Coordinates of C-alpha atoms and ligand atoms in Angstrom, one line a residue:
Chain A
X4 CA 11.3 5.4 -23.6
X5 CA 13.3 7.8 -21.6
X6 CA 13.3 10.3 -23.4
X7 CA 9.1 10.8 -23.7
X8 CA 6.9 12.3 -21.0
X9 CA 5.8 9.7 -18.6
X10 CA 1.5 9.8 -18.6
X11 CA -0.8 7.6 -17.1
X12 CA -4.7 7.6 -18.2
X13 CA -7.1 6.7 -15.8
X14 CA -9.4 4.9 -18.1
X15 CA -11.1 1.4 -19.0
X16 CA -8.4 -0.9 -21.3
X17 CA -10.6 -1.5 -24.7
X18 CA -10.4 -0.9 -28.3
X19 CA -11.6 2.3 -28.0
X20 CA -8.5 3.3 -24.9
X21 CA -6.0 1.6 -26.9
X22 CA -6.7 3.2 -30.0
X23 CA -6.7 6.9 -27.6
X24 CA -3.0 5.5 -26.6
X25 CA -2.2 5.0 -29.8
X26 CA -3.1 8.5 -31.1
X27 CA -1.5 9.6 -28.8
X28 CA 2.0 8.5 -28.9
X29 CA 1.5 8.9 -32.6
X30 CA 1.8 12.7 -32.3
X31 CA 3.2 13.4 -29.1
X32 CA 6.4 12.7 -27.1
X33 CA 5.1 10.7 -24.5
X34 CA 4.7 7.2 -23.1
X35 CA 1.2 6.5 -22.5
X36 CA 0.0 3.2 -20.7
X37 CA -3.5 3.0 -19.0
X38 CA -4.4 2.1 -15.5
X39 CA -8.3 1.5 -14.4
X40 CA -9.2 3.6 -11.2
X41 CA -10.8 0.3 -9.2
X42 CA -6.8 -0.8 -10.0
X43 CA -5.5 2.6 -8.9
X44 CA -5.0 1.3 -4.8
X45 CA -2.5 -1.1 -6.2
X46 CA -0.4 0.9 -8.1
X47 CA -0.5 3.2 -5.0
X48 CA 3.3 1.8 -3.8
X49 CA 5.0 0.7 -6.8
X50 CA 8.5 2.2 -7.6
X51 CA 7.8 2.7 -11.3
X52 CA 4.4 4.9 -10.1
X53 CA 7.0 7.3 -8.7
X54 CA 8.0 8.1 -12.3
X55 CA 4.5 9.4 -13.9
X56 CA 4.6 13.1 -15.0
X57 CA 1.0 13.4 -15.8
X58 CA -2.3 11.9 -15.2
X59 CA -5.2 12.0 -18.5
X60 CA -8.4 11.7 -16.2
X61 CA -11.1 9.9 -17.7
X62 CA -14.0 11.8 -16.6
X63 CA -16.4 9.5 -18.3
X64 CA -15.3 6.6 -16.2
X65 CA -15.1 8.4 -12.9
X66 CA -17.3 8.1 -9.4
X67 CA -17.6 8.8 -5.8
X68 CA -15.9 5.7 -4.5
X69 CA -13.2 5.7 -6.6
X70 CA -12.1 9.3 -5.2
X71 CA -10.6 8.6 -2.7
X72 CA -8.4 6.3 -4.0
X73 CA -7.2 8.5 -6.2
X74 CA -6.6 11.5 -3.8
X75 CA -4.3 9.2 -1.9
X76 CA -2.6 7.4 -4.7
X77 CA -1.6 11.2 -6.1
X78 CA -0.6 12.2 -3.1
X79 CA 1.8 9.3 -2.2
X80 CA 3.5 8.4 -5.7
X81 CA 3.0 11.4 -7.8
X82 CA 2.1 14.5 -6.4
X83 CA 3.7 16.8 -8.3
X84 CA 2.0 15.4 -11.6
X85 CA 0.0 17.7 -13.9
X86 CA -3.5 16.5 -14.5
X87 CA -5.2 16.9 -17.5
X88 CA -8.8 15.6 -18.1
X89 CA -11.1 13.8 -21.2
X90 CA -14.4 13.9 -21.2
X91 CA -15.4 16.2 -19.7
X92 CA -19.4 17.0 -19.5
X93 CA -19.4 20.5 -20.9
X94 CA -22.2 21.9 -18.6
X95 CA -19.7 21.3 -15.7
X96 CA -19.5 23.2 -12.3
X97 CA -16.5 24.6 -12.4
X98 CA -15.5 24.4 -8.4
X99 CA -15.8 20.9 -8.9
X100 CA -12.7 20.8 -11.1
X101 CA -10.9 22.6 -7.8
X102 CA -10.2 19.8 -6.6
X103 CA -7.9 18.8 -9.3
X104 CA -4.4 20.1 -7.4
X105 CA -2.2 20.4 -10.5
X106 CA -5.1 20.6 -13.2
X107 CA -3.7 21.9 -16.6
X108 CA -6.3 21.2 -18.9
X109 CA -9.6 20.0 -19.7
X110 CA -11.1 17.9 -22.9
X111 CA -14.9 18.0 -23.3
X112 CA -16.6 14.8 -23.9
X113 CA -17.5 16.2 -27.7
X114 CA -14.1 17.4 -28.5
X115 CA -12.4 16.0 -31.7
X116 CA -8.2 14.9 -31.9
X117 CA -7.6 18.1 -33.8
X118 CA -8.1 19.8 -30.4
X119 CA -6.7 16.9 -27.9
X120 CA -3.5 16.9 -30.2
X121 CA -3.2 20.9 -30.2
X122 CA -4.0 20.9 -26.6
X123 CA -1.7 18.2 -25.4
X124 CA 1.3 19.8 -27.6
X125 CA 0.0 23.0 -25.4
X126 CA 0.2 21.8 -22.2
X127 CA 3.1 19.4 -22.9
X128 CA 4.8 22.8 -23.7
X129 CA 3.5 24.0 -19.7
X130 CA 0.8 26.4 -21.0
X131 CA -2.5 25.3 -19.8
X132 CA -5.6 24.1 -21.7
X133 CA -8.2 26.0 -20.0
X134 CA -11.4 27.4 -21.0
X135 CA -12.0 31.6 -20.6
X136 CA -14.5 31.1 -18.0
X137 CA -12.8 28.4 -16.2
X138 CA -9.6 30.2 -16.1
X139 CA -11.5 33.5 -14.7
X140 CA -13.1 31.2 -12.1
X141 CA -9.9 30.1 -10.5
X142 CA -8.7 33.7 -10.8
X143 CA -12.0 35.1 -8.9
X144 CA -11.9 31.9 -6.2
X145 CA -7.9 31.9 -5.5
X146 CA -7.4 35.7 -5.5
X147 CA -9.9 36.2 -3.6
X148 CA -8.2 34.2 -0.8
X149 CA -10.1 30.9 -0.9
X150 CA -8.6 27.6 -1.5
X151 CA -10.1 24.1 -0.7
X152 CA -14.2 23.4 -1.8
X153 CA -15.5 21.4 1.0
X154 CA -17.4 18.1 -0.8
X155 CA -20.5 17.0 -0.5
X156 CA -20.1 13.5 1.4
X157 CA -18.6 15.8 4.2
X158 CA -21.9 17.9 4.7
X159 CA -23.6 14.4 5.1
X160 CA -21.8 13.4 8.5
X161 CA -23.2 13.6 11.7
X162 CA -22.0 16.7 13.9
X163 CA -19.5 15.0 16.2
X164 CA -18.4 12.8 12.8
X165 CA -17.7 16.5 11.1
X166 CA -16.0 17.8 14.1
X167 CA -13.6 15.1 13.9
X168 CA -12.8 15.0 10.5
X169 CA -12.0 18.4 10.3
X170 CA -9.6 18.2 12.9
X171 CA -8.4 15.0 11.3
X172 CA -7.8 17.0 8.1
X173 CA -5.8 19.6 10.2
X174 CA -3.3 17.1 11.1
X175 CA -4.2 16.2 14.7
X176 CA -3.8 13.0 16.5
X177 CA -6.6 10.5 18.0
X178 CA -5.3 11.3 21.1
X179 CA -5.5 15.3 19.9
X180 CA -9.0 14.9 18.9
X181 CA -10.1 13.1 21.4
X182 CA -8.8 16.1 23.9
X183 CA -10.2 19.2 21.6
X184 CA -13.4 17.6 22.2
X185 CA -13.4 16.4 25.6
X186 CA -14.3 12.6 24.5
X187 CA -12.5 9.1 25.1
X188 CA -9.4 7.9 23.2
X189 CA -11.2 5.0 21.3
X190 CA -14.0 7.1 20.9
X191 CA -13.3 9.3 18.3
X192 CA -10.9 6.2 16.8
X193 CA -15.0 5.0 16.9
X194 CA -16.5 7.4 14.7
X195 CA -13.7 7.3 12.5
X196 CA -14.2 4.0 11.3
X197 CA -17.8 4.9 10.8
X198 CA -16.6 7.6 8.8
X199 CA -14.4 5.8 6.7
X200 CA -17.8 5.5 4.7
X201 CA -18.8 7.0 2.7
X202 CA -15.0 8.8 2.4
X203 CA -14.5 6.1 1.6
X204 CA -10.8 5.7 3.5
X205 CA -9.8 2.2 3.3
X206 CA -7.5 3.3 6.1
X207 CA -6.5 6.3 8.1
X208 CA -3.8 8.1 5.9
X209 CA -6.2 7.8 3.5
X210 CA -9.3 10.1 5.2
X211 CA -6.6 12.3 6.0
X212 CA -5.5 13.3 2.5
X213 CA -9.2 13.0 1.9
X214 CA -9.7 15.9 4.2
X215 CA -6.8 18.0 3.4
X216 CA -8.1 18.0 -0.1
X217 CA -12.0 17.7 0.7
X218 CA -12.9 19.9 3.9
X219 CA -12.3 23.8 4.1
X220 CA -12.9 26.8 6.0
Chain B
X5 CA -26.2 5.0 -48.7
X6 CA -23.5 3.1 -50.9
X7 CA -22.0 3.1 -47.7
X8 CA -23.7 0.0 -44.6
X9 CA -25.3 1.3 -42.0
X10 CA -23.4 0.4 -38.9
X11 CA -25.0 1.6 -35.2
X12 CA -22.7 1.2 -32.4
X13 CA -24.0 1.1 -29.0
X14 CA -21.3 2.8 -26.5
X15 CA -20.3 5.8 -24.8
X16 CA -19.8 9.0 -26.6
X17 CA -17.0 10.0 -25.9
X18 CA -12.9 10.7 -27.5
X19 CA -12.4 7.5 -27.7
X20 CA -15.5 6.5 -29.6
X21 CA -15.4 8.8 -31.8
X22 CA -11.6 7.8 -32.6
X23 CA -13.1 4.3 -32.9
X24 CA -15.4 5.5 -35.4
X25 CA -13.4 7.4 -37.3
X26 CA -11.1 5.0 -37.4
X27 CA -13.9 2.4 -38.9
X28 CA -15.2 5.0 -41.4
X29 CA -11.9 5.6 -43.3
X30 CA -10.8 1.8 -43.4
X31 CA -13.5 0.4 -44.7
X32 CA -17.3 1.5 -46.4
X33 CA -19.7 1.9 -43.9
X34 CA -21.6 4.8 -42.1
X35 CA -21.4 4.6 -38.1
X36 CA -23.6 6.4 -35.8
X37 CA -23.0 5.9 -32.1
X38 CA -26.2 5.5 -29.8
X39 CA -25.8 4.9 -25.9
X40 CA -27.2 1.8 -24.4
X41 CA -29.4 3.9 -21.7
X42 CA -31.1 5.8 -25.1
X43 CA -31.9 2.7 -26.7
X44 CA -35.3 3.1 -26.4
X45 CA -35.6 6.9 -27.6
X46 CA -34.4 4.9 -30.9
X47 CA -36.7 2.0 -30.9
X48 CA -39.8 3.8 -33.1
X49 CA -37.9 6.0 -35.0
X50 CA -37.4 5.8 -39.2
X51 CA -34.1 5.9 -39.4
X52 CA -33.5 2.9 -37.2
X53 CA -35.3 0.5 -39.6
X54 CA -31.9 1.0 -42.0
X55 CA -30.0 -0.2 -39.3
X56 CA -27.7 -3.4 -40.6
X57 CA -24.9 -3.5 -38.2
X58 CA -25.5 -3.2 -34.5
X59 CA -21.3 -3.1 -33.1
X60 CA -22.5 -3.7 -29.5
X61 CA -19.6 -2.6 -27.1
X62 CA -19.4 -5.2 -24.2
X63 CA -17.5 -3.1 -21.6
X64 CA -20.3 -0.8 -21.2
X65 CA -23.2 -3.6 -21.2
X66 CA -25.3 -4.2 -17.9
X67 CA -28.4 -6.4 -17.3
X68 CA -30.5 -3.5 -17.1
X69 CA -30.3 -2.5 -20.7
X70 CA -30.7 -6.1 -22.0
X71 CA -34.5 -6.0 -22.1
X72 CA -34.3 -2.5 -23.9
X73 CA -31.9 -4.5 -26.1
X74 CA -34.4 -7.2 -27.1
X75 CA -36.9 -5.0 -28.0
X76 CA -35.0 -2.5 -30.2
X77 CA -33.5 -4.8 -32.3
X78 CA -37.0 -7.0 -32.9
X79 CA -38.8 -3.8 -33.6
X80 CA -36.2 -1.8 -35.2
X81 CA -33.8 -3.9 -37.1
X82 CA -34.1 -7.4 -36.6
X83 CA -32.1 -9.1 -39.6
X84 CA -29.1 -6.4 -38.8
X85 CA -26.0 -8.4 -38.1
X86 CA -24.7 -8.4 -34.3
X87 CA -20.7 -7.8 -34.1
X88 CA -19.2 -7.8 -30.0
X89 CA -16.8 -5.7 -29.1
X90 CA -14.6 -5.4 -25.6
X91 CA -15.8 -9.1 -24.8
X92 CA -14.1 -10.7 -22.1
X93 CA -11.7 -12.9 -22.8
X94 CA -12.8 -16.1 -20.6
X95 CA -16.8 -15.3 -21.6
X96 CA -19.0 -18.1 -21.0
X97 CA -20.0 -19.1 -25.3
X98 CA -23.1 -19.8 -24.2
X99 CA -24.0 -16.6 -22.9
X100 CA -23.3 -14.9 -26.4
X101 CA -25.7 -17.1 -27.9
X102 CA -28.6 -14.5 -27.2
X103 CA -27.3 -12.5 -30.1
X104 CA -29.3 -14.3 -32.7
X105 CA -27.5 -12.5 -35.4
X106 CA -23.9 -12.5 -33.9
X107 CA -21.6 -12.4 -36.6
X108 CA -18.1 -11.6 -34.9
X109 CA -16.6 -11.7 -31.6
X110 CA -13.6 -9.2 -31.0
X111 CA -11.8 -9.5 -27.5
X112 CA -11.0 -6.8 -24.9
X113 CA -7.4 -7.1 -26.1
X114 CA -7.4 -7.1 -30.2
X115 CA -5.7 -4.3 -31.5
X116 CA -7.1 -2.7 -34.3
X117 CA -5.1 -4.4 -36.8
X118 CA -7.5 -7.1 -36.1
X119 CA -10.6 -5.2 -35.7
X120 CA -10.2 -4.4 -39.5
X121 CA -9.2 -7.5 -40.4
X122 CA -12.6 -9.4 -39.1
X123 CA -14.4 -6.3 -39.8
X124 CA -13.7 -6.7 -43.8
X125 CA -14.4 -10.5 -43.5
X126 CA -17.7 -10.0 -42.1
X127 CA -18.6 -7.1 -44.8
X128 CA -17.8 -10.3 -47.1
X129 CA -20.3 -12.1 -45.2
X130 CA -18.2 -14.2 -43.7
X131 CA -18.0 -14.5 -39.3
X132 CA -15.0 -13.6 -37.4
X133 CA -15.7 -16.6 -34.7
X134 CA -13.0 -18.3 -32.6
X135 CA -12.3 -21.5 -33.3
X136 CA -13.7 -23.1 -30.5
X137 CA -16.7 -20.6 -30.4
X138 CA -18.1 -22.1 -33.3
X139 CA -17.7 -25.4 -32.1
X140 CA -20.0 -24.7 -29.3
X141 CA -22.4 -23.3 -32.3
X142 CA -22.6 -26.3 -34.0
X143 CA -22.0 -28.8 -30.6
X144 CA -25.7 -27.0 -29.3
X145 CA -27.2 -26.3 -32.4
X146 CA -26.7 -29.2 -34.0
X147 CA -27.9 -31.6 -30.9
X148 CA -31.0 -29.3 -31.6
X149 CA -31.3 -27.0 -28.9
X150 CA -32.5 -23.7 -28.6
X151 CA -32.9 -20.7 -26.1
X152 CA -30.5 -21.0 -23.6
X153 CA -32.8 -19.7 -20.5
X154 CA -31.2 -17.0 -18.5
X155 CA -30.0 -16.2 -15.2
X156 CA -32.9 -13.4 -14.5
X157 CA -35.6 -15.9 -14.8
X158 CA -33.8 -18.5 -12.9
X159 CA -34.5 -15.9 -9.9
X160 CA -37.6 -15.4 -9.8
X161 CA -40.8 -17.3 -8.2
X162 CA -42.6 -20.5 -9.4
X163 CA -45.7 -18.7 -9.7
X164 CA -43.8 -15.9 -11.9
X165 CA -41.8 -18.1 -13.9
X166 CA -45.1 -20.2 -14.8
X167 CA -47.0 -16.6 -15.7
X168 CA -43.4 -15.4 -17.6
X169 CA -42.8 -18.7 -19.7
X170 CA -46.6 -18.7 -20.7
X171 CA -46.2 -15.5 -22.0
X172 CA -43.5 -16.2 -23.8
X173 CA -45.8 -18.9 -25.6
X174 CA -47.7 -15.6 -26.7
X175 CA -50.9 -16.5 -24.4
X176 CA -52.8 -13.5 -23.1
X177 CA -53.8 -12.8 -20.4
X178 CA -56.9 -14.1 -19.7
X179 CA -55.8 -17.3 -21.2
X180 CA -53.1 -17.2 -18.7
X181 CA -54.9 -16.7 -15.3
X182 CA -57.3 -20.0 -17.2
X183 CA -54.3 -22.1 -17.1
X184 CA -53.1 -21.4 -13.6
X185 CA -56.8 -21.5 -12.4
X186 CA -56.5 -18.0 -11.3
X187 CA -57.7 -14.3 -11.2
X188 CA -57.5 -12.5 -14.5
X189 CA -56.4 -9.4 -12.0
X190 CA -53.6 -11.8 -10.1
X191 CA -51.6 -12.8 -13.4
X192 CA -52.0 -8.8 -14.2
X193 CA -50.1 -8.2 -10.9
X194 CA -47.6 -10.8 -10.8
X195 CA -46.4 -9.6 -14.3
X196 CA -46.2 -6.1 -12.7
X197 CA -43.5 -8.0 -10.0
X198 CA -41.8 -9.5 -12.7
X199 CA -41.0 -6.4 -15.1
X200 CA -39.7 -4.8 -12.3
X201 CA -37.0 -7.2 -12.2
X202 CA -37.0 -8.2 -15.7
X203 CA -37.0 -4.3 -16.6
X204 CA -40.0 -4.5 -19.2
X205 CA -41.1 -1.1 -19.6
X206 CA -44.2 -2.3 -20.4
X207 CA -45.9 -6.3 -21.6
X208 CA -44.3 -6.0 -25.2
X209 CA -40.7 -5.6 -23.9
X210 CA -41.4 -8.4 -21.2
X211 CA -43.0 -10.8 -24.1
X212 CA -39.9 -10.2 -25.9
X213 CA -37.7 -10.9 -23.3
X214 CA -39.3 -14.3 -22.9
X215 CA -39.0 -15.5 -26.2
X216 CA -35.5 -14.9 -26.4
X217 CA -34.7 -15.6 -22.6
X218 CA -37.0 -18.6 -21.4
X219 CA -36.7 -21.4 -24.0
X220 CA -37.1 -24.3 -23.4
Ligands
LIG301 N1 -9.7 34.8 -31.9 C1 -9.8 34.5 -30.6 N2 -10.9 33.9 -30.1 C2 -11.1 33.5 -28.9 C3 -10.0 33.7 -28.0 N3 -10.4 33.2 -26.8 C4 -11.6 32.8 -26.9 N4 -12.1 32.9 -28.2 C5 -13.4 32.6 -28.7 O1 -14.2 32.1 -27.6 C6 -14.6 30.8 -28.0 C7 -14.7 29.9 -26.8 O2 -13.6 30.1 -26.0 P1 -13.2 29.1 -24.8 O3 -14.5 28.9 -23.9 O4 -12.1 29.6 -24.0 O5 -12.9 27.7 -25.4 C8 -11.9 27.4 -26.4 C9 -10.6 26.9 -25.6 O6 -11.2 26.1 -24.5 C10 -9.9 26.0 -26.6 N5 -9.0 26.8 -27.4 C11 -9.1 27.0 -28.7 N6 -8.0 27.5 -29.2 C12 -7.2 27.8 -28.1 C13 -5.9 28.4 -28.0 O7 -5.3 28.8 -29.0 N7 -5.3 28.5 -26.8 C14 -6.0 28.0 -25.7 N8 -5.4 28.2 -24.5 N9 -7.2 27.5 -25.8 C15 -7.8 27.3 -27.0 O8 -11.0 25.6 -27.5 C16 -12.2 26.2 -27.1 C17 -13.1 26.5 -28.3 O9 -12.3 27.2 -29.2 P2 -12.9 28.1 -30.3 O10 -13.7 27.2 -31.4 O11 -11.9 28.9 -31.0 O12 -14.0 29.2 -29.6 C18 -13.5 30.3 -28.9 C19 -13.2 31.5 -29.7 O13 -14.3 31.6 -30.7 C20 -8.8 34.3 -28.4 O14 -7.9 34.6 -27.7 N10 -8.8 34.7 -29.7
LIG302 N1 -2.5 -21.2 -39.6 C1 -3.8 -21.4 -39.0 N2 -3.9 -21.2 -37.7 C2 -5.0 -21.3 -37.1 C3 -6.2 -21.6 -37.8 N3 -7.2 -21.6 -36.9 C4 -6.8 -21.3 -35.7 N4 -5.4 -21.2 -35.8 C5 -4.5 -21.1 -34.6 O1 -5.3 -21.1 -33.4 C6 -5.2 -19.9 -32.7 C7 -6.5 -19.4 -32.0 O2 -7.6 -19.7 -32.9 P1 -9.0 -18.9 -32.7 O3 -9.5 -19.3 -31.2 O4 -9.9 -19.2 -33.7 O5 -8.6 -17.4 -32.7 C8 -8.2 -16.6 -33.8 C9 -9.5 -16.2 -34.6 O6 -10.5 -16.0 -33.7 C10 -9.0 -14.9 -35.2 N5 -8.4 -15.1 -36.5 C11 -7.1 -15.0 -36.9 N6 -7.0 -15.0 -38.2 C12 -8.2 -15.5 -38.7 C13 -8.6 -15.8 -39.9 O7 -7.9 -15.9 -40.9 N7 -9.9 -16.2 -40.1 C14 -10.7 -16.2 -39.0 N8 -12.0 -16.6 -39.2 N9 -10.3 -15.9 -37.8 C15 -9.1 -15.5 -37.6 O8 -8.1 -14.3 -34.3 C16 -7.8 -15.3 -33.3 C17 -6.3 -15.4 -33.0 O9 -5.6 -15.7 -34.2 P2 -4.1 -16.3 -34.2 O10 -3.2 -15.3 -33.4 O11 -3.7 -16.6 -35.6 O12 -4.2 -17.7 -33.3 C18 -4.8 -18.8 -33.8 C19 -3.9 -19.7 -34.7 O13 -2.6 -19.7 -34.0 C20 -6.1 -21.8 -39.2 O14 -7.0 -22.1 -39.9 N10 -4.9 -21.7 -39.8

């Protein structure tokens, strides 16, 4: 429907996701359909992907290699999204949620529909759905000056590997990289594909927006 | 009670609990929801003994937990009726034969207008089986076979499968290394190999694999 919110959980399809969907819609104004993350890369160029307003993360069904997938599919179709997130385990660390861009709110994984629906209608009215604590974190962090947490797969690369990916994640060319550290053309386009794992980066563009979102100061 | 007790194995999570909530007020019955991975925290316990539903959610199944599977429901609850859930729509109907009490099948894609609708047949006793599912039922059955021996065992070596399949006989040990001709300590640590890769915690859970994973 036009008129509804367009939202798109990143979640198994099963009875249990369906019945979600249909709760949902139910109660809210919005247009719900549900897109696995290992089916997330192909829904990465699509016109219609263009369109989605908000994305209900699926904590539960989330990992490492799916990450950067996502990072690059918000990025490209949908970047100015809201994200909201279910299932949340409730003895999270809270800079890991930073790396949410637009997080509004977050659904522990033993939260009942009474507090998704009153939540939802929250957010879906732009207040946010955040927890006291949370919220002071991002106050203390952001205020403070600071911005992006650097991961954890980064700190696991080699030295040269880091120097180049921070670069990379600053915008500068092969060629660039190459000549900030004094090293061959193809070398650094070397390392590079080595780093595309564990990052992950089925290509270039991707590791980029990984690093722009994953590596800072 | 008044109400059957029905033990779900899945995720906690919103969605389960919508699931569950939305079993509990359509029909009588008393849900619980126990993870696949805690399985065997439930195994010894009282309360699983009352057990006479297990809904067993397919999507968030693995190989691993199969042996934990086995041994739960033998111990625990083994006349509870088995009822599928998320099953793949192209599954193999063999594979789903391991379920010795499988009483319904419901597909990665029914909505819950039919969950209900099989649901409330099967609290009547009868089985919410495809059409051609029970077909293969009666095709296997009937030609009198069995066990339908599983993929895990396939993998492993002659001398493992000989010490596994014997086991699954019931023999012990020592009546074991006596068929093979070999070391009572040998068939010990050839067993050791195989729960590894069978994942028995121990020679109960690996017996009780057999029996239901090594016919014929
Ligand atoms: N009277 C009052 N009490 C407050 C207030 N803020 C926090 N609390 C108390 O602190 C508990 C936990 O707050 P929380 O971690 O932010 O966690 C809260 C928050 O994450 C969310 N929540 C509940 N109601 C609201 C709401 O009206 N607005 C927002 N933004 N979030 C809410 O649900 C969680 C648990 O809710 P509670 O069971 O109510 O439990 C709340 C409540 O007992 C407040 O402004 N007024
Ligand atoms: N009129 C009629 N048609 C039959 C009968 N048996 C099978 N069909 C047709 O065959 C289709 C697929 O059969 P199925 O694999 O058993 O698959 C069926 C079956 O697994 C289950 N189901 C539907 N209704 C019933 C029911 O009344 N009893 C049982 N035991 N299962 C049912 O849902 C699946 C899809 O149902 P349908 O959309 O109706 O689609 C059914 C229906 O179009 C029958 O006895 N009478």
């Amino acid at each position: 429907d036009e008129n509804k919110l367009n939202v798109r959980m990143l979640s198994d399809v099963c009875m249990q996701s369906r019945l979600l969907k249909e709760a949902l819609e139910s109660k809210l104004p919005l247009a719900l359909e549900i897109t696995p993350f290992s089916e997330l890369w192909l829904e990465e160029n699509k016109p219609e992907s263009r369109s989605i307003q908000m994305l209900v993360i699926d904590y539960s069904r989330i990992s490492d290699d799916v990450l950067t997938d996502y990072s690059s599919f918000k990025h490209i179709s949908c970047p100015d999204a809201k994200e909201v997130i279910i299932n949340c385990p409730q003895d999270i660390e809270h800079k890991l949620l930073f790396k949410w861009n637009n997080l509004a709110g977050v659904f522990y994984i033993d939260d009942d529909m009474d507090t998704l629906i009153k939540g939802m209608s929250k957010i879906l009215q732009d207040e946010m759905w955040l927890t006291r604590k949370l919220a002071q974190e991002y106050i203390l962090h952001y205020r403070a000056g600071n911005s992006v947490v650097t991961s954890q797969m980064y700190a696991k690369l080699t030295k040269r590997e880091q120097q180049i990916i921070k670069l990379l994640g600053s915008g500068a060319s092969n060629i660039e990289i190459a000549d900030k550290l004094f090293v061959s053309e193809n070398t650094v386009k070397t390392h590079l594909h080595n780093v595309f794992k564990k990052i992950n980066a089925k290509n270039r563009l991707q590791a980029l927006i990984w690093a722009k979102n994953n590596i800072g100061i």
